């Protein structure tokens, strides 16, 4: 099976830039399609962007342009970057195979001053 | 956006008895709309896949039905470990969007 799983930090500041790893095992990111997704602390689920198996993204206008989508083929990891973070991305942060099936363990992300 | 609407946002049931959980969608979506299933601090677990499509390893008392803007999760003779939030998904357009749940509680 696939496994996937997130790096990052467990607390940042406001206006910091937010960047996360999700490491994948078992399946390559060259081909499909690949997920960032975010459970807010009040159980809200939020789509946040994808990038296929060529490298385009896809991004939440909720976003407003603060996030970005990368990838390292040669490690067989996707990136996540959230710029000028507030209190409303504290979140429990998922990279997921586009399907649905197979999601990383997931990150807590708290925003706060 | 497609919007999607979940109602009830909370139902109580008793064990043993059935449900159906409603996700109505602002727009259609075709047969674009997924379940999840939502317990504490784990990731969402996928039980319904393209409006009715079963999928392996999750229990048969789960199944999804409807089209275009009404759709139904029916889980029959309800299990206390069934007890937790229910999301529906868009798949159809860009960006993809979650209904706000249901939460099934034990009456």
Redesign the interface.
């Known amino acids: 099976d696939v496994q996937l799983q997130e790096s990052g930090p467990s607390l940042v500041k406001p206006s910091q830039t937010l960047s996360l790893t999700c490491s994948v095992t078992g399946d390559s990111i060259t081909s499909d399609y690949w997920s960032w997704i975010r459970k807010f602390p009040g159980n809200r689920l939020e789509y946040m962007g994808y990038v296929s198996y060529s490298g385009s993204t896809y991004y939440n206008p909720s976003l407003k342009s603060r996030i970005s989508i990368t990838r390292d083929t040669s490690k067989n990891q996707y990136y996540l970057d959230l710029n000028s973070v507030t209190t409303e991305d504290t979140a429990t942060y998922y990279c997921a195979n586009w399907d649905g099936d197979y999601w990383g363990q997931g990150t807590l992300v708290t925003v706060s001053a | 956006?497609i919007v999607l609407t979940q109602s009830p946002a909370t139902l109580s049931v008793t064990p043993g008895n059935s449900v159906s959980l409603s996700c109505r969608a602002s727009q259609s979506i075709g047969n674009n709309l997924?379940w999840?299933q939502?317990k504490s601090h784990?990731?969402?677990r996928?039980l319904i896949?393209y409006a009715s499509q079963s999928?392996s390893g999750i229990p048969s008392r789960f199944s999804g039905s409807g089209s275009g803007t009404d759709f139904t999760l029916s889980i029959n003779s309800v299990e206390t470990e069934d007890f937790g939030?229910y999301?529906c998904?868009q798949s159809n357009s860009?960006?993809?969007?979650?209904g706000?749940?249901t939460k099934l509680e034990i009456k």
């Open positions: 956006d997924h999840y939502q784990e990731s969402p996928l896949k999928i939030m999301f998904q860009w960006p993809y969007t979650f706000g749940g």
